[PDB]
Amino acid sequence: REIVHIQAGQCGNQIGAKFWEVISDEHGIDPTGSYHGDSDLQLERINVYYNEAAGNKYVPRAILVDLEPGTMDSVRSGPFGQIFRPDNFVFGQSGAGNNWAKGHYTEGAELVDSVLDVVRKESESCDCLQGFQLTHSLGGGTGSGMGTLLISKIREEYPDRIMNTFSVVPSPKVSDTVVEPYNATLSVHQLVENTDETYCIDNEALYDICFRTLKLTTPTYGDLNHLVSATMSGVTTCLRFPGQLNADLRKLAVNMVPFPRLHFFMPGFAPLTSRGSQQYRALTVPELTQQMFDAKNMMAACDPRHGRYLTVAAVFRGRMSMKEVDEQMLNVQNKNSSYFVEWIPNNVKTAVCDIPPRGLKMSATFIGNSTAIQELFKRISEQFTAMFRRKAFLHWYTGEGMDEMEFTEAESNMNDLVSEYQQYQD
Amino acid sequence: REIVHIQAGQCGNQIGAKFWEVISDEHGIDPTGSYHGDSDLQLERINVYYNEAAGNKYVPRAILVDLEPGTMDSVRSGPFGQIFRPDNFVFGQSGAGNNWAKGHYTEGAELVDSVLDVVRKESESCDCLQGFQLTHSLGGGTGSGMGTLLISKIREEYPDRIMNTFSVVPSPKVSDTVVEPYNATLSVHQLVENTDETYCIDNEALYDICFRTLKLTTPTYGDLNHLVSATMSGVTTCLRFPGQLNADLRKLAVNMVPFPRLHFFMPGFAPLTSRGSQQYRALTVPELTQQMFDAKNMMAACDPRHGRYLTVAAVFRGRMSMKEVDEQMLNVQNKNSSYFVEWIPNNVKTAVCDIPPRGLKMSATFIGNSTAIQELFKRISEQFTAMFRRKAFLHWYTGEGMDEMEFTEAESNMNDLVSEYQQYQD
Amino acid sequence: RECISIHVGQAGVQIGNACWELYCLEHGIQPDGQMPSFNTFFSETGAGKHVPRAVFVDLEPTVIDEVRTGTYRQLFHPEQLITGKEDAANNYARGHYTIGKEIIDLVLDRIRKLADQCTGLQGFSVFHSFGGGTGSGFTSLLMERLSVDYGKKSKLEFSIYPAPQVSTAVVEPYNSILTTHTTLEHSDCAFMVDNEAIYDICRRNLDIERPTYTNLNRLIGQIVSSITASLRFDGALNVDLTEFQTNLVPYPRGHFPLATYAPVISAEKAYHEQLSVAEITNACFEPANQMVKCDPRHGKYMACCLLYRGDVVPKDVNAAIATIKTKRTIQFVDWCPTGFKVGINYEPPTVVPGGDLAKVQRAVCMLSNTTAIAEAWARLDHKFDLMYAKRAFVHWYVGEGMEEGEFSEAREDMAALEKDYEEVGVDS
Amino acid sequence: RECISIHVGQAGVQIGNACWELYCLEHGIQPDGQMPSFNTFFSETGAGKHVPRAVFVDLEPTVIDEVRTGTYRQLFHPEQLITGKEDAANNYARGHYTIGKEIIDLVLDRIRKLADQCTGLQGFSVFHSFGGGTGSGFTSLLMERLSVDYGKKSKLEFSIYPAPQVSTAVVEPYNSILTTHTTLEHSDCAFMVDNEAIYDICRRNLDIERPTYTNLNRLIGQIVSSITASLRFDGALNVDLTEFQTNLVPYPRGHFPLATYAPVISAEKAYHEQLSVAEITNACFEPANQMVKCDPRHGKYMACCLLYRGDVVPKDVNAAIATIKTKRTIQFVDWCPTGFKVGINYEPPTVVPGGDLAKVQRAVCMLSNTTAIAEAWARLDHKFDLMYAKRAFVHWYVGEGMEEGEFSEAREDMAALEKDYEEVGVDS
Ligand SMILES: Nc1nc2c(ncn2[C@@H]2O[C@H](COP(=O)(O)OP(=O)(O)OP(=O)(O)O)[C@@H](O)[C@H]2O)c(=O)[nH]1
Ligand SMILES: Nc1nc2c(ncn2[C@@H]2O[C@H](COP(=O)(O)OP(=O)(O)OP(=O)(O)O)[C@@H](O)[C@H]2O)c(=O)[nH]1
Ligand SMILES: Nc1nc2c(ncn2[C@@H]2O[C@H](COP(=O)(O)OP(=O)(O)O)[C@@H](O)[C@H]2O)c(=O)[nH]1
Numbered sequence A, B: 001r002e003i004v005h006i007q008a009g010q011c012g013n014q015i016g017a018k019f020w021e022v023i024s025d026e027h028g029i030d031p032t033g034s035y036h037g038d039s040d041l042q043l044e045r046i047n048v049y050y051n052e053a054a055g056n057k058y059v060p061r062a063i064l065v066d067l068e069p070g071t072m073d074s075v076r077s078g079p080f081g082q083i084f085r086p087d088n089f090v091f092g093q094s095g096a097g098n099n100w101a102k103g104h105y106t107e108g109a110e111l112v113d114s115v116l117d118v119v120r121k122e123s124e125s126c127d128c129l130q131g132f133q134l135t136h137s138l139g140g141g142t143g144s145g146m147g148t149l150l151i152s153k154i155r156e157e158y159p160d161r162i163m164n165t166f167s168v169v170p171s172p173k174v175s176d177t178v179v180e181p182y183n184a185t186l187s188v189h190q191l192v193e194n195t196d197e198t199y200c201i202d203n204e205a206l207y208d209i210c211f212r213t214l215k216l217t218t219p220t221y222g223d224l225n226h227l228v229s230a231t232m233s234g235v236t237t238c239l240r241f242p243g244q245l246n247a248d249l250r251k252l253a254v255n256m257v258p259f260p261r262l263h264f265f266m267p268g269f270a271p272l273t274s275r276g277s278q279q280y281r282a283l284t285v286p287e288l289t290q291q292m293f294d295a296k297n298m299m300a301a302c303d304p305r306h307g308r309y310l311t312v313a314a315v316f317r318g319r320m321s322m323k324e325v326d327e328q329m330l331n332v333q334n335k336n337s338s339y340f341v342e343w344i345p346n347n348v349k350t351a352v353c354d355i356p357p358r359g360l361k362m363s364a365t366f367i368g369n370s371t372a373i374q375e376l377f378k379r380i381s382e383q384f385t386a387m388f389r390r391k392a393f394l395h396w397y398t399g400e401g402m403d404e405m406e407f408t409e410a411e412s413n414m415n416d417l418v419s420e421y422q423q424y425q426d
Numbered sequence C, D: 001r002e003c004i005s006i007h008v009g010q011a012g013v014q015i016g017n018a019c020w021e022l023y024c025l026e027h028g029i030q031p032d033g034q035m036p037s038f039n040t041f042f043s044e045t046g047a048g049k050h051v052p053r054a055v056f057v058d059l060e061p062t063v064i065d066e067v068r069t070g071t072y073r074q075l076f077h078p079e080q081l082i083t084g085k086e087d088a089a090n091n092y093a094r095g096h097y098t099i100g101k102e103i104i105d106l107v108l109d110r111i112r113k114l115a116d117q118c119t120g121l122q123g124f125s126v127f128h129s130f131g132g133g134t135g136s137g138f139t140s141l142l143m144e145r146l147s148v149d150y151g152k153k154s155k156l157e158f159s160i161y162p163a164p165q166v167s168t169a170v171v172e173p174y175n176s177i178l179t180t181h182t183t184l185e186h187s188d189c190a191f192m193v194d195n196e197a198i199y200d201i202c203r204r205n206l207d208i209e210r211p212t213y214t215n216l217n218r219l220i221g222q223i224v225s226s227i228t229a230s231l232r233f234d235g236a237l238n239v240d241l242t243e244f245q246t247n248l249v250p251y252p253r254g255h256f257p258l259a260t261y262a263p264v265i266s267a268e269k270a271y272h273e274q275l276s277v278a279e280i281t282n283a284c285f286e287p288a289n290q291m292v293k294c295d296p297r298h299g300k301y302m303a304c305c306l307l308y309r310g311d312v313v314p315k316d317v318n319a320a321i322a323t324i325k326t327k328r329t330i331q332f333v334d335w336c337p338t339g340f341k342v343g344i345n346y347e348p349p350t351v352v353p354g355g356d357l358a359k360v361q362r363a364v365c366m367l368s369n370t371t372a373i374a375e376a377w378a379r380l381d382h383k384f385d386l387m388y389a390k391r392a393f394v395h396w397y398v399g400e401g402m403e404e405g406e407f408s409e410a411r412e413d414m415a416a417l418e419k420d421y422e423e424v425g426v427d428s
């Protein structure tokens, strides 16, 4: 029944800053820590993410990890940085510098032991864990590097808990680190087989949505990470709150994974349009389904109609008829039958929660597992190869002891995921 | 049951500005979008042209298309530009410049894909489309050029929906573009066989009516496009509202088209006279029929008594007896038997609606299909030939890749319509 | 002893509106169905509400919606009110085939439901128009099924006869020709009236120069009630609908008895004038009250049925008959002796409150089958021919799957029908 | 004369919520248990509170918590409300084995406690769904134990039939195939309904285009009450649950009678319309009121049971039966003569205040075993096959200890079942 969340890397720490904000919004918990809500449900299932400390203080069940105090400090300095206890800030001193080898292989490795100890302390604080969630970037040093290391140890300690992670996937246009594909390649090599599932977030796609449908001209990462948190929070609240359908994360995982190795997801979100049009929108189930199916409302820079859909999850929040939902999902399946895989009859699955997100009447979360995902892997693998041959920045990595044959195997493994998507693309 | 309307070109955009204004007048819909009427019927069949968005907002089911933001902006800036959603404004940047080749063949072609996507989104928003209507100029770049391209694709997607269009036909005296007959020729070549029907509006004739019977000395295009919208709105309201006769657009199309290729119409309108005489007018069915038959009340610069009448539709709005209507139409047929075609017994057909246009007790719309229409084609074809031989401005068109043999075929096709009118003129 | 009314198309439904209004007027039926008091047409609920056993079909929502928003919306059962979304477009090709054929199954199942509600289905009658898409298209489609399921029940049709001078439907000849082909062969009897002729009645006998369909259908309703309400009510000679068929249809082709109705008199015309049974029947043989523009003197009579309301004494009727048999110029076909059906109901004639017709104490309806009908077909023959020779409007049918041969064929069937009239005209 | 209801899974419990609400409505039971007035289902306390003899099982706290926080939280005994912490995840492998098998012992002991409270246990019935983890997984686990301890008691199951078009559970075929294997062999009779078919009922007979499960379960509750409340109440022909089994199960396989219910009528549809017993039963043989999307005309009937509420006179029933035997197109299997069980209760049909269905004075429930069910299995066969051929999602079961052979086996058992239907279809 409970979940532990660990954030890492500057990305992960800033995403989590919005995530937790939202969760407390959902439950009426003040930036200082106490509960000042107003709904029974708000406290009722609070356990999944909060420990109530003496005084009616709620402690977010999460660990903030970094290798630079300053980022942690900036998180702590805002509202909701006060709700986190000092003991959840685990950090070192001297960066990682966006270096996998430092993060995973060497220096960051050193910190992980202290992180894990706190993890253990929290695992004991829970009655019964459902699982763990981690937030991070695929091409980052602590985000992926150190984060991955941690994941391999947590999974080891808890094989029976859900291990998932959401991660920022290097967008085709904006890479920061020259070896960002290298770090990503290494994380695939480690993560894929050490996780139950991973979500693919593309900032470029997010920037398109924010202007494309939301028509906004000023977003920052906090605004885009709001959208990220909308999908993350969407998933777990249902599990928390009363609904109609089947509201268990593990069951979601079961329904979305047809094969042990292909567990990559494309998140999307509805409704998600500018205020101008809000006066011209109608709120129906087909309306949400139109926004959910549309590739432009995906947060991943993929194109599901290019690939084939293996699995689709449609999560609904708010009062909807069962009939309408059933029929519209069927219609989707029918009309987009050319994209769905024939091996899975009725490949579109649903989940229904009766609690709407604060401020909306209804909402829906799109989760997909298509073959289209392989295109991201292909882009990375290719870029990787070029760098691999030149050893760009690999003296930094090999200087910290990372061996090229390990990287070679990592490359293969990327290619293996692509070939397996092809194996089920048919 | 529903209709989608697409406006294009500066002409089409400004005509539509009046059209939609009127439709909202008909239903009591405020310039800001909400319904503030006062009749049951006003909301009852609103579906054909409006989507009710959340909040009792009505969204006109239409797409505004141009290649210059400024025209679109001017539309948006007035009342009823606020009722349109931003998503219905599809436009590019850099004109067309009244160039078919740019509009259709090259640049405007690029935009059409985004237009069509929105079209598709609306086709899904409808329960059941009756058809589509487009407003444009025959000699214009986006009006005809890009507009035509769009039509060919919409027809392709929906063979079973009504495809009609109203278009400004180059008046003998006022052409703006030197190659306006060229653009028109090309549009015939494309449109005639890619449409179910097209209406022929002549601004010159309109300017004569406004002074001839309406005795006005200040009209602008908004005043003349009011008259245009009177005929357009006249047609669809009946379909919308309760009447006596047979109030279906498709049925109108069926009754007015005797031959697959000859579907050109001459709109006219009654009552349509100055206020001075309004104190000396009587309102009877023969009164309306006198105004309807009279060629001077036609909006097309043709002369129906020069040609032969193939089909006539008389649409009536308001309470009239069936007897009177029947008898007067018969009388018309009788007295003007020399203009009607002998192959069609009782060539004058009627349609009756019991709802009068706001402010009038009664009104009638004249729709005709005569052979006289061919005279317009003849004028264009001739002018075309001269230009064709000289290639006036064809370097602009051939510079964008338009081939002269395509134009040659277009010329033939114009001549073919004339010969077919001759074939049924007898 | 039950029957079903079927209203197809606007014409069918709007006429039906008048018809059911009149039946309500006949018994004091409230809009909600409450009747304080004719179960041959109506089905009773435990609330004392009665449901008119009828089906309303329109492929365009609007007219049925008109019903649904009017007073009689409470009377009709929502399942009786059947609507599609799109029209036939004046066109058999869609009405009978492409469009109407999709919904007809529903329609039939509602009919069958009512047939199961009937305990002694005597039969039914269908109201429509010869020119329209659903009016004639869909209509014949229905007959195709009803004649199978209800083969032994009365199949009476009532249709508006296309006015020779005014018609709003350019392909009406084509529609009507196709219906001939398919209705002749399936239906038992089809009756028709001409709105143009009716206008002349309104202006000459009612003195009204402003008739609308809502006037025109009241007059039609009168005629219909004489044969529907009053034939179930008490009289001297209680004539049934099956009896009507058994007394009006002489051949297995169809036949097409035309309506004539006298009295049709304005209130002022009723003053200062005393009608007798005989005088009313004199009016019935006058061209002037002929409800179809076709000259009674042109053709020869084959059938004739006179149905009486109110103050009618058989004694007077007998005398009247004697004079119409011998005084008039009514030529009749050899085949027939003058066995004219006399229905005599004690049930008085009724008048619509706020209507045009005067309160009368007695009334006579006349049905007649005359050879002049072939001229009506001749009208259609040429109208069809003209269009068909040019092939005007042909693509509107061809695109729905119609065949040109079929159209020729249908014309030929009409020609055959005309020839059979020719045959009957030849006395023998 | 007692029985136990068992509610497993959300579907089981939420349906149960409607069911027990209806039983409260049947007797005026207050949320606190106070009843001022059916002890076959309820156990009485000295306060006059009655406890519904039922067990609620959910492995996720939430739904039971919904009960615990609602009005009926006072009605139910805290021990009846059993909850685990974690879910089955749509998965038999955890529902039947890994997870549910841990709590089941508790569950059974509460059942046994109630069995000891029963003095004359007639039997019990289990509410669940064919696709879910606890809905079908845990459910069969329970049957495995209950069939030992209560081998001679009624083992009736009610389950939601997986909609062919909409399903939220990607491995539902796999779940359902495994249940077939284990339920066929243990249970006595399993009934099922299709929410998609129900939606069609809601939109056509109730005229509702917005059904939620809370509507859908009211309708289910109606059907259930007819066979649970009214079979314990007085009638002409008082039919027991054991009698139901003894009159509905023809073979030792299972059988799967499907539900049909007529009247399902909106308030407005009830107006202007008079139903008789015969008319209601006519509706019962219409595909249109079939609660499972499976065509009654496709298969042949093997069993049929009609249960009557309110104003039903055997006299009328007899006539109705005569016509359904002879008028309809109902083909039936040789083996069977038409001995259709007629249960006739004087107990009137009841309606949920604020519900959609109209107050009716009489009502008929129909159970039927048709050969068309094999097509339902065919649907599952291919859905299973597709997944299984690719081995999609297989690791979610294998990791819990499931065997691939087992899955093949279960499919084969289904195939055998289909073959037995084939057999029955062959007349002999
Ligand atoms: N007497 C009478 N005739 C009518 C009435 N309404 C229409 N008609 C006539 O019936 C014909 C019109 O048929 P429409 O209304 O065009 O069509 P429809 O038969 O309802 O079916 P669609 O073509 O598919 O709309 C014309 O000949 C009219 O003169 C009416 O209320 N009374
Ligand atoms: N009629 C009806 N069907 C329902 C209801 N709730 C769920 N269902 C159906 O039953 C199936 C859902 O099962 P779930 O809710 O996913 O699962 P469960 O059987 O409760 O058990 P778990 O998988 O372990 O949560 C779907 O086919 C739903 O359409 C309900 O209240 N009424
Ligand atoms: N959405 C999102 N992406 C971020 C944020 N911060 C850094 N990123 C992305 O993360 C990548 C850089 O890795 P970084 O987080 O600096 O690595 P680390 O800090 O060394 O673990 C780039 O692709 C950025 O676009 C953020 O707050 N939101």
Ligand SMILES: Nc1nc2c(ncn2[C@@H]2O[C@H](COP(=O)(O)OP(=O)(O)O)[C@@H](O)[C@H]2O)c(=O)[nH]1
Pocket: B008, B009, B010, B011, B012, B014, B015, B096, B097, B098, B099, B137, B139, B140, B141, B142, B143, B144, B168, B169, B170, B171, B174, B175, B176, B203, B221, B222, B224, B225
């Ligand atoms: N009635 C009418 N005609 C117009 C309007 N605007 C331009 N026109 C006519 O359209 C032709 C010019 O084409 P234009 O609309 O400028 O082409 P485009 O804008 O490049 O697509 C001329 O014959 C004008 O008389 C208008 O608002 N009303």
Ligand SMILES: [Mg+2]
Pocket: B246, B247, C009, C010, C060
């Ligand atoms: Mg109509």
Ligand SMILES: [Mg+2]
Pocket: A246, A247, D009, D010, D060
């Ligand atoms: Mg559950």
